[model samples]
Each structure stands twice: as C-alpha cells, then as structure tokens.
Target: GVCDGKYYEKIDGFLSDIECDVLINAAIKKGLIPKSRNSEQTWFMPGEHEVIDKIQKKTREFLNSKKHCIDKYNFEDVQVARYKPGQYYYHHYDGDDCDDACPKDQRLATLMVYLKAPEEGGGGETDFPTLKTKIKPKKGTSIFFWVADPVTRKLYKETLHAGLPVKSGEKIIANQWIRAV
Candidate 1:
C-alpha cells in the first residue's frame, strides 16, 4: 500500500516471541475480543486484554519517531477489533469524542495490527477508498495511518474506512489511534 504525507514502521523487535504469546493468551482469556457478533462470523475476537500498556509504549514510540522524522504527533488510545466469516465493519472513521466512551482529541491515527491471519478464507480486508489502498490481515504485520486532520477531528464523511466481508476464516487485529497533543 502507498501513502502520501505519513510514515510507518514494521515495528521490528518490541515484542519477543514469549511476549507475543502472552499477548494473545491474555486477549483470549479476558474475552477482550468476542468470538463473533453472530454465528457465521464465529472465529472473530477483539479487545485490548493484553497489550494496553505495550500498545501505549509502542504508540508513543511511533509518535516520537514521527516527531523526529516528520513533525510532532502523539498517540491517544488503542482498541482491538475482530471480524470473521461474514462479519465486518463497513467503511467508517474513528470518532474523536463519543457520547460516553472515548474523550475528545483521542483516536487520531488508526493503527491496525493484524494478529491472526486468515487461515482459509479470503476477502476480509481493510480498504481506504480515497487512498485506493487495501490491507489484508497478516500475523504480526500492521498498517497505521491518519483518520483526518485534528481540527475537524470528530467523525465525519472524509474519514472513511471499512472492513470487507470475510469468506471462510478469521481476522483479528489491534487498533490504535494517534493524536496530536
């Protein structure tokens, strides 16, 4: 995928093999991620049951890296989402402020960390229509990008994103948003 105005890192060695195992275990145990909203999408799960702290550190590091590389940017919060066969999130943008959840100025960049890649299915991919970029879930691989500029940061039409439906397997991911503070 190609992008204009932002940079991202593959995150080469922050989580060790054991740490990754623990992270996945923690998420499963806590039920932070649900198996599915429906029976058809039975393999999906999402929640930051394990990597909250880790994500915070990594997000800060990313922001710091960007600060030196580009301009100054900061991280806000992280969220995990899951999608299984037939279950997916239609294109939508992260909301800066929620009615009761998430504070304003939060959720700047949506960092999607693909954990469990699809085993047999296909079609569950995230697409940035305007950017004409598409991403499929890959174990340990990720795609991080901005939702929109901070000023009109609240969810709107410009911030469009979507999770294409899955065909047969599961798609698990860690999502984090960056903020300029």
Candidate 2:
C-alpha cells in the first residue's frame, strides 16, 4: 500500500467503459487545448451534465470509503487531459505550492483516471521517481495520490511524478484535486 500514512493509492477499474466514454466525449466535445510544457492536452472545466455529476459523486464516495481523513478536504473541478504521441510531462508535483489557483490552503490529493489506453507499442506510464512506482496508462484505472503530507498538513516531496511520453497512440485522462476544506 502506497497510502500507508495515506499518501497514495491505486485502483483498477475505477471507471467502466461507459463512464470512461462519457468523460472522453465531454473532453472531445469541448475540445482539448495544448497545455504549457506539453504536459496536459485538455483543460476542461465543470459543466451541466449527468456525466460530470456521476464522476464527482463516485470520486466523493471513494474518498469517503477510504480510512483517511475525509472532513479535511473539498473536491476541485474535474480537468480532462489528453496526451498524444511524443508528448510528455517533465517531473512535477501537484501539491499546494505547485500552482497559484488553489482556493483553499493547499491541495490534499490528486485523483487521476485513465480514460483511454495507449495502443500497443506506446509508452505512457506515470512515473514516480523517488518511490520507484511506475504505472502504465490503462483505461478505467485510477491512481489516487496525496499531494500534501496527511499528518503534518504540508506539501509532500515524494509525491513528485511525471507523465511519460506516448510512443504511438494517444492517451486521455482526467485529474481532480482535493484541497483542504
């Protein structure tokens, strides 16, 4: 378990094909834009749709089910991202100090759902350098990791990770950050 002190955890089949499709469709319909450093492709915000609601609901349920501090955080808007061939993200952290738009104090956790798998021969695994955790981009699989230390309530250093380059096929994913409520 990666979440020994509640730092990170991985879940397989976190979303069904239909659920994945709903998110992918939403991103496609809204259109994906290239992000800085070629890290992420789409920047989708919340909208009026049952798909969005379902995603939020399921995410909340999962967090609530976990044996961690639940009342300490509030969920952020869903961000749909895509990665094309050759595109990669350099090592980065998703903690509170990483960005300036966080409304609350700091980001508590990062929940990323893989909506589409890369084709065979493609290389797009999420890499955690310090922890030696490399996760392949598999559709329906979700990776939940802590951005800040649960006990100290500070940004974590071991949470630094990167999105590896895609060799041939495309990769689509969504990220949701939970912040201190």
Candidate 3:
C-alpha cells in the first residue's frame, strides 16, 4: 500500500542502516529510562553527536519539501524509546493544547521511525485502533503523520495511538514531535 498523503504516510529508506545504528548507540549508551513513558525512553540532544545533527536536519528538510506538511512548527527533542518484552504504552493523544482553538504551543505533527525490531517473538507494532492501522517495527523506516489537522491545526481524535506489547527481543524507535511554536 502507498502512503497517499492523507492522515499518515510511511516512507521506507528514510535512513540508512548505519545511520540507524548511530542513533541507537547514542540512545542506548546514554541510558534509556526504564518504565518511563513507553517502556523506556531517552531524550538526547542532537548537538551532542554529528550524526544526530544530520538526522534532525534531515527531518526538517523533509518537512520543508512537502507542501502538505506544516512549516510553522518547531521540533521537540528526538526521543529514543525501547520497548522490552511485555512492555507497552497505553493509547493516548499526543496533543490538543487548546480546548476550542489551535495554539502555537500545540503539537502539529509527529514523526516516528524504527531503529530496531525483534527478530523473534516480534509483536511490537504501533497500533492506531481509531484508524484500525498497525505499524510493524522495522529498521530504517519512518512514519510521518499529523496529530492535528494539517490545514486547520485542530486536534484529531483519529490520531490516537499506542505501542503494543513486545513478545520478545526489543522494539527500538525514535519519535519527534513537531510543535506549532
């Protein structure tokens, strides 16, 4: 299936294998917070490593190239998350800062990519039950989706998502939230 640029799009070859490993090494070595938000997560600064800087820049460049993407937002820190066996995150909304209106501080878009996936007992897939879509974890592949309406900037109820339990091995990913601010 193709992305179609509707509410979400999956793009393969977003990053090279080596690039994925570099980010993974930095995140894992920096110590992921066990039992923190989604299983374990580590927020590392892009300026700390050269490759990290490249990855972050690549994301920005990608957005700039897409007319459908929001250009009025700034990215939050990249979160490197690891879901060990049995780890999972409950379904939740990423943002809707204002009650009846869009705000500059609200989340506009979300970018997520898998750095590693379990070779065995691999059940960790990003579940968007509202949309009835589940994304299997795979290295070097990224998914871009709008948390809020791309044009209206209104929070979307359909974008609620979660991480399913990992049966074995590990599910590692990096998530970047773009804020309208």
Candidate 4:
C-alpha cells in the first residue's frame, strides 16, 4: 500500500448519528441476505429512500469540503453489510479489471462507514495484513482506500483486506465504490 499518504485514509465520525441511524434502521428493515462465508448484505440504490438521498448528498458535501483524493469520480449505490457472530470474509479486492459491476478497472476507490459497531468482546475488525493495519468497528467512523492508482493505472495489491469474524455481536457497515469513468 502507498502509505506515503496516498493508499488509504481513516475518518472519525464521518456520519452523524441521525444519518447512521437512518442507514442502520433501513438496512435492518430490509433484512439481510446471507452469502456463503460472506457478509449478509443488501443494496440501497440511489433515492431508494430519503435517507439514501441524504447519504449521497452528505457524501458529496464531504468530498467537496476537502481537497480529497477521490473527488473526481462517480459512485455506485450503497451496500449495507452485516456480520453476525462467527461470520467473516476472506481477503479480497474490491476492484477487479473484468468486473461487470463497473467499467474495466475503473473501480478506483472504496468508502466504508460503520453504522453499528459490535459491543465489547466483539472481534469484528477490517484487517489489512499487507498494510499492517486493522480497523476496529466504530459507529459513524469511516475508512476510505484506493484500489487502483489513477496515475499509474495499477492496482494496489497491498490493498487486499478482510473482515474478521464477529465474536460477540453484530457488525453493520455501509460501503460505496467510486469509479473513475
């Protein structure tokens, strides 16, 4: 990973309580779809709800508020993910050159927001072993990372990461992928 201030970033309290609640409640209401050894997940398409719209607006405002690395790109719909006790995901890359979800290798970045963090004893943390980092789940906090370098057109192999199992509680998060098209 480009630890020289370019591969990834962490933002504390990136979402307000109300916004986080909205996302959490909505996802809960929609329920979850369990995937084999993967997180229970669902999509919140653009304008699916007022909260979704609010999320999009706030995200844009956030990007514009700073000279951000991922300002010039289009974003995909939000994906709400849940991991109950014992659930986990193996290491994987969010960007794939032949992915049908986005244009060829255009998935440049990922922004993940923790809506509900597991309580004490919960071992749900996003692990980036290659980067020598692990992020504990924290409500309203967010982590953003680059998957592909815009300048070099190269994928950052060190960006590979995984979701550690939740040992004591559930972990809920919302993720958005930004595409450079």
Candidate 5:
C-alpha cells in the first residue's frame, strides 16, 4: 500500500451516458462470445476508436492527478469485458508474475469502468477478497486498484480481486491497465 487510502479507488464520470452507450454498442457490434464462454473480451488499442481514445486520454489524467508518484503514462490497451448470468473472473493479481524487484515496466494499476450494470440484485460485483471490499456494478462508474507499490515496484499480494458472478443479468465493463511510467 504505497499510498494506503489512495491505492484502491472508485471513479465516477469516467464516461458520460453517450460515451458509455457508444462503447457498449461498439462491443456488441464487435461480437462477444456465446454462453459457453466464461466471459467475453475484446481489446482496443489507443487511438483505435473515438470512445476508446477519449477514455484512454482520460485515464492518463486520472493517474496524472496523483502527480509524479504515479504510473500515469503508458496504457496496456483497452479491453471490453462482459459477463452474462453465472459467469465470473476469480480473484487474481494484475501483476502477480512480474516480480523482478523494482522492475521498470509493469502493470501498476487497473482502471475498470462499468458500461452497464446488471439489473438490481442480479449479482455482479467486483470483489477484493483480501481487502474485504466489494463494488457493485454501476453504469459509468469505475473501480481502480494498484497491483504493485508505486515507488518500490513491490507486488501487493493483499490486493487480490475478482469479478463475482452475474446471477441473472449481463454485466458490461471497460478495463484499463496502467503501465509503469
């Protein structure tokens, strides 16, 4: 926890209604995996599309607000993720395998935005097992968390998280990862 209270966070207004709708539509048009899939995912490089580019630029500003002590520069592409009834992503670390002490390049933080929330009580939530935190999906809201100590590049084992199963509806989100600056 390099910045304790600041390490894990929630961001709102990361995308407007129009941006969210456009991104969601773009994902659907790109095609998602069918029911046999655990979840569907599609990637978009920076500068690839209008909505994605806007979010990528905003992601930089989000980390930049924390000044030089943050991994505010490079992006590890943008990914659109979806879970339909019963699918989930188990607890995991964003940079669990990059443990070369103080490495210069690593996935330092995750910025995930919810493009669509599951119906009320439909059961999609981002859960931080170790921290005892659970974030319910909310349209346009983002969940952010650090995977390694900013200054030390030390892995934070306690930050393990997962996308809990969506019981009855669909959960759609955009995932952003920040590379070390």
Candidate 6:
C-alpha cells in the first residue's frame, strides 16, 4: 500500500469559490463525459483541473513535503478527475495502454484529491490493497503514495484502487501521478 500513513489537506485562498464553480459549470456545459453508460458515473477526465491551477501547484507543495518522499524518487505528473452522481471508476491499476509518456516502470506515485463534499450515501472510498487502507472522500483533501517494481527497474505493482458508486450527489476529485525524473 502506497498510502500507509499518507494524509490529505484542504487548500485555502488559492482558488476562489466562484472560480471553482465556473470550471465545474464549464465542464458540465462542455459535456466532457460521453453519454450512454447506463450508470451516471460518466464524467470528463478534465485532465488536470484547468480552473484551479492551485490544485496542481499546491499538490506539488504537499508532495514535495517530507511526508511524501517524492523528490527523492523523481516523480512527476498530476491528473485531476471529476465524477457525477452514480459515476465511478472500476478497480484497475494505473498502466493499461502502455503509453510511452507514462511508461509502466518510471511512474512511481499517485495523489487523489476530493474536491467536493460528498452527499449522504455509501460510496466514494479509495481502497489500497497493499496497505489495507480505505480513504473516505472529503473536500480539499488529497491522498498519495509511492510504488516501485520489485523485479525490473520499473516493474512495480500493488497500486489498485476503485471509485465506488456515489449513492447520491456528484463527486469531484483531483489526481496526481509521479514518475522517475
């Protein structure tokens, strides 16, 4: 488990409430997610929260902190994710397509942020199998940890997680992935 004692924090004064809202509204208007998945979990990848540059900037601040061990390992890349009501991601590892940009090996860490407060329901917990940790969704909080391959120079595994279904309202999040420099 990469997130053994890993924790998340809320950011203040960076993105105004209105600015965040504007980005979300734009996302909805843009229909970043494709329609027709039966379930409502469909959402736009958003890549990395364009509206809030602070999310990425501050995330780097948190990752660079002593707690995360990021700089020591040479990690990079952050992805911000957004989900609507009933939308969620199934269980899967980080690497699937084998893109050269994200080589399965060099990538070393992932940070997930819960941007919006969750509505009443039973869903939206990040499960870490290796560490036996389940992170509850909370606004302004980020979760991250490191992973490495035991065999090859970059053959690492064990970062498996899922975005369980949201019982009620929408869930928005920010994600950061780190790799060897």
Predicted structure with the largest TM-score when compared to the true one: 5
Question: Which regions of candidate 5 fall more than 4 Å away from where they truly are?
Answer: 33-37, 98-104
Among these predictions, the greatest lDDT belongs to 5
Query: How big is the positional error of residue 124 in model 5, measured in Å on the Cα after superposition?
Result: 1.0
RMSD in Å for model 4: 3.6
Worst 10 residues of 4 by lDDT: 96-105
Q: Better model by TM-score, 1 or 3?
A: 3
lDDT of each: 0.57, 0.76, 0.78, 0.77, 0.80, 0.53
Off by over 4 Å in 6: 1-22, 33-51, 66-80, 96-105, 147-156
Better of 1 and 6 by lDDT: 1
Full ranking by lDDT: 5, 3, 4, 2, 1, 6
Question: Each candidate's root-mean-square deviation in Å?
Answer: 6.3, 3.6, 3.4, 3.6, 2.9, 5.9
Clashing pairs in 3: none
Estimate, for each residue in 4-84, the C-alpha lDDT of model 5 and write its tens digit: 466588878778978998998888888855223378899886677898888778777777777756744578889998898
Compute the lDDT for candidate 6. 0.53
Q: Which ten residues in a row have the lowest lDDT in candidate 5?
A: 29-38
Over 111-176, each residue of candidate 4 has an lDDT whose tens digit, in order, gives: 889888888978989999898999998988889887876544456777888888899878988888
Residue 36 in model 2: lDDT? 30
- The reply for model 2, stretches above 4 Å from the true place, is 1-3, 33-36, 43-47, 66-68, 98-104, 150-152
Q: Compute the lDDT for candidate 3.
A: 0.78
lDDT of 1: 0.57
Pairs that clash in candidate 2: none
The TM-score of candidate 5 is 0.88
